């Protein structure tokens, strides 16, 4: 990574 | 007022033609194996998502890759295992062979099929001409079947295509970010690595498709025939889109933004400037110059489109004569 989802 | 909708222009209902358990994951029941099936030999690495370790099945004595989830709400650990059911056996794509229960996290363990994979940092530096075209072929066939299967990949990137270089294997792993393509549906811009996100995150643009994983190719692809790795070489997410715009232009990036009717963050007032769209031949050197041809340079033209709807589709892509000379199965 290098960011994050929750959509 | 407001953003212009988009839709993909390939794939776009496939989704609301298939039954509502093939995408509706949040209902998916998941059968589960047994973990004392697997014994746990070396850790390779940890992100912010899970632990991944390199493992045994003990019953047939073959190599696995365990992916042990940190704890995340149900739906998107379910979304992963839904997305990776529905592309199992697919060309290129990773092999979810079990899912068991890993007894110390109380978290779902995802075993994979192994892969021989040599890191790509030391891989790319020996690819050829050839091997480029040949595993970007490999590539695009993963893309294509999860695009015409209603998927995004949403994280493609070196780091999440093993590639087994002595038996010319490869698959396309890390499905944790992927998401279903329901048309108009606004999605999370804080998909992908930043080296690789699509002008669409970088403005803010939530309406993407699947036309963001060939922005992401594009750049693999930049930085391989350039030998730059990577290829826009971002600070932050801000300096990310300034990069871009130093090859790409500020022209077409205005001219992006104002057909879908965006207004970037004012944060870019001062930083974004005035660029012209450079010509590739700018970044061909003696270094790199047996990697670049009319060919490569004209299918990343192609790929490197500020538009998403202007991107080649994963299917057009395959049809490029960048891709004539590989022998193909
Ligand atoms: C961002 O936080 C990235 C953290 C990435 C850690 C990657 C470790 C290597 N890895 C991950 N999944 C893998 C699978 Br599935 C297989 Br199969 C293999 Br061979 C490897 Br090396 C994997």
Avoid at chain 2, 64 to 73: F, T
Avoid at chain 2, 80 to 100: F, M, Q, S, Y
Avoid at chain 2, 134 to 148: N, T
Wanted: glycine fraction near 4%; charge should be negative.
């Amino acid at each position: 990574x290098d960011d994050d989802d929750d959509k | 007022s407001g953003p212009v909708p988009s839709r993909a222009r390939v794939y776009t209902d496939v989704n609301t033609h298939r039954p509502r358990e093939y995408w509706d994951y949040e209902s998916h029941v998941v059968e589960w194996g047994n973990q004392d099936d697997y014994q746990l030999v070396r850790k390779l690495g940890r992100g912010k998502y899970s632990e991944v370790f390199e493992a045994i099945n003990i019953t047939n004595n073959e190599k696995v890759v365990v992916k042990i989830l940190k704890p995340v709400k149900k739906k998107k650990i379910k979304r992963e295992i839904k997305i990776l059911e529905n592309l199992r056996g697919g060309p290129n794509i990773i092999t979810l062979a079990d899912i068991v229960k890993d007894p110390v996290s109380r978290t779902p363990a995802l075993v994979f099929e192994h892969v021989n994979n040599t890191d790509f940092k030391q891989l790319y530096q020996t690819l050829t001409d050839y091997d480029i075209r040949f595993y970007m072929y490999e590539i695009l066939k993963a893309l294509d079947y999860c695009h015409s299967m209603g998927i995004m990949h949403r994280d493609v990137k070196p780091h999440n295509v093993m590639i087994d270089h002595e038996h010319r294997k490869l698959r396309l792993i890390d499905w944790g970010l992927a998401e279903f393509y329901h048309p108009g549906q606004e999605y999370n811009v804080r998909v992908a690595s930043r080296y690789f996100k699509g002008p669409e995150l970088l403005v803010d643009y939530q309406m993407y498709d699947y036309s963001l994983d060939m922005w992401s190719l594009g750049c693999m692809l930049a930085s391989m025939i350039f030998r730059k790795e990577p290829f826009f070489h971002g600070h932050d997410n801000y300096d990310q889109l300034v990069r871009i715009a130093k090859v790409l232009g500020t022209e077409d990036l205005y001219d992006y933004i104002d057909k879908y009717n965006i207004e970037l963050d004012p944060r870019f007032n001062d930083i974004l400037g005035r660029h012209s769209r450079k010509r590739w031949e700018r970044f061909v050197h003696s270094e790199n110059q047996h990697l670049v041809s009319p060919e490569a340079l004209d299918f990343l033209d192609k790929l490197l489109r500020y538009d998403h709807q202007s991107r080649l589709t994963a299917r057009e892509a395959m049809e490029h004569p960048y891709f004539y000379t590989v022998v193909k199965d």
